């Protein structure tokens with residue numbers, strides 16, 4: 001599914017991401033925009049052979065099992081295909097584990113490079129939340 005901005009904002013808010021570990025909702029929406037373009041089905045392969053899955057482009061080396069990433073931890077205890085669902089529950093629950101991991105949202109390279117230190121409130125402006 002390709003989310004609309006406000007639609008995703010509302011879903012992320014419902015799943016407890018607004019202010020999760022101190023990151024306002026706008027951060028999460030920004031990160032989803034530049035990671036996946038709001039498309040739950042986005043995949044992208046890395047040079048290391050791992051792949052990133054879903055709206056938040058969660059990586060198969062650490063976080064999910066895709067059956068093809070040797071010596072990967074599956075710290076979210078999920079098949080990586082669960083991350084591509086139109087229901088973002090799994091992506092959100094895994095993202096909460098990642099963000100808790102000690103590097104915060106810097107784990108998301110597009111967040112660091114395109115959202116961090118910008119006016120991220122702009123990503124939820126106009127939305128009914």
Ligand code: NA
Nearest residue numbers: 060064072073
């Ligand atoms: Na893995």
